């Protein structure tokens, strides 16, 4: 069984580069237009909209508009199981804040955060963490009595 993975990456392609390094297959949310997915997934997304030294989870701009639109589709949203976020620690209290926003507002675990295209340690930690994450779903199977 392949873990479900969905990501967004802008013209700078840093999240795309991270996903390529992961060695796990993934579906990219496009710059424009609707897509749909069919099986449970973890979302990897970068953070935009920074600037506010004392930020608030509800202030808009952190989550890419294409991700908001993707998650407005009830079926896509129903299949979201967790989030991994990227950013730049120079943003301080706003570092990787899209992960905070998605995890709190969609009620899913915040699995990991990283900077830019990620380090080798980030790649390894995400590969191991995703494996452990999907294994934990096997603790939730229906009764077969
Ligand atoms: C306009 C703009 C705003 C950004 N705002 C934040 C931010 O609030 N917090 C953060 O951690 N990174 C912020 N970043 C850094 C990006 O999240 C980072 O460069 C990321 O790697 C971009 O991913 P992408 O190349 O896949 O689009 C911002 C970058 C830009 C260009």
CB atoms within 10 A of CB 120: 8
Q: Among 47, 1, 52, which residue's Cα sits nearest to residue 25?
A: 1
Q: Which residues pair with 46 in a beta bridge?
A: 86
Give φ, ψ of 27 to 5 degrees.
-105, 130
> What number does the ligand 1 atom closest to the CA of 64 have?
27
Q: Say if residues 108 and 100 touch (Cβ distance below 8 Å).
A: no
- Cα–Cα distances (Å) from 80 to 40, 51, 65, 83, in that order, read 6, 28, 17, 8
Rounded to a whole number, what is the distance in angstroms from the first to the last CA of the chain? 25
Structure's resolution in angstroms: 1.1
List the alpha helices (DSSP H) in the chain.
14-22, 65-72, 74-78, 97-106, 120-137
Domains, the chain, in order of start with CATH, read 5-131 (3.40.50.360)
Which residues lie with the beta carbon below 6 Å from any ligand 1 atom?
Answer: 9-10, 12-16, 46-50, 62, 86-88, 91, 94-97, 116
Mutational test site, ligand 1, from 16, 48, 51, max ligand atoms within 8 Å of CB: 48
Tell me the C-alpha distance between 26 and 79, whole Å: 14
Mutational test site, ligand 1, from 20, 47, 112, max ligand atoms within 8 Å of CB: 47
Q: Among 32, 45, 44, which residue's Cα sits nearest to residue 5?
A: 44
Q: Whose CA is nearest to atom 30 of ligand 1?
A: 48
Structural method: X-ray
């Amino acid at each position: 069984t392949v873990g479900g993975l969905v990501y967004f990456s802008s013209v700078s392609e840093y999240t795309h580069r991270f996903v390529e390094k992961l060695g796990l297959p993934a579906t990219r949310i496009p710059l424009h237009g609707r897509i749909e997915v069919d099986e449970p997934y973890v979302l990897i997304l970068p953070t935009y909209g920074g600037g506010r030294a004392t930020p608030d989870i509800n202030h808009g701009g952190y989550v890419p508009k294409q991700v908001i639109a993707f998650l407005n589709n009830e079926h896509n949203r129903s299949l979201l199981r967790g989030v991994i976020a990227a950013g730049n620690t120079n943003f301080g209290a706003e570092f990787a804040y899209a992960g905070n926003v998605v995890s709190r507002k969609c009620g899913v675990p915040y699995l990991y955060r990283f900077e830019l295209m990620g380090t080798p340690d980030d790649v390894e930690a995400v590969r191991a963490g995703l494996a452990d994450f999907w294994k934990e779903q096997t603790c939730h199977l229906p009764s077969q009595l």
